[PDB]
Amino acid sequence: YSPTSPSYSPT
Amino acid sequence: NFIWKGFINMPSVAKFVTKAYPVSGSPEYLTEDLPDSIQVGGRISPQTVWDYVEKIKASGTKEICVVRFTPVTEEDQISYTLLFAYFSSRKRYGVAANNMKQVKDMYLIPLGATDKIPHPLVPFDGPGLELHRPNLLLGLIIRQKL
């Protein structure tokens, strides 16, 4: 089981 | 007794040299897993990170390392302060975009001098953080364990 990195807003 | 020395680089905000010191679960072999220059490629809400961190803990497949960044010169400190203010004023954490193979995520956390340590990182397993401190950038490193 491997949680996916959350999305973020790019800068 | 610093773990790593290199750049934090957030395009058009600040680029400076820093030393990273252990806070919690941060062995010196982290030196091998951080690039020469950490590229800050995004920003993210703290609540989103803390939700992710508790799934990471439940998986048992990662290690959560906390490090403390320190500016190396007075010139570095000016930019360090710019970057702290960038994230602090927006209530955001920074997201690294150029992680090495063993690092799943790295977040940059602005910790105000009188702020309380965000509770998912408590308690520390390592030197920890002193009570009396300047405004700090912490690095939250999510590293592959197994």
Identify which of B13, B52, B58 has the shortest CB distance to residue A6: B52
Torsion angle in degrees (nearest 10) through CA of B21, B90, B83, B143: 40
Separation between Cα atoms, residue B14 and residue B84, nearest integer Å = 10
Mark yes or no for CB contact B44/A11 under 8 Å: no
CATH number of this structure's domain B4-144? 2.40.290.10
In the chain, the amino acid numbered B96 is A
B10 chain-A contacts, CB cut-off 8 A: 11
Q: Please name the method used to determine this structure.
A: X-ray
Model resolution, angstroms: 1.9
Separation between Cα atoms, residue B12 and residue B32, nearest integer Å = 27
CB B55 within 8 A of CB B105: no
What counts of helices (H) and strands (E) characterise chain B? 2, 7
Partners of residue B138 on adjacent β-strands: B68, B109
Residues 6+ away with beta carbon under 8 Å from B50: B118, B120
- Scanning every residue of chain A, which has its alpha carbon at the shortest distance from the alpha carbon of B44? A8
B95 chain-A contacts, CB cut-off 8 A: 8
How many whole angstroms from its chain centre is CA B95?
A: 9
- List chain B domain ranges: 4-144
Torsion angle in degrees (nearest 10) through CA of B12, B18, B23, B26: 90
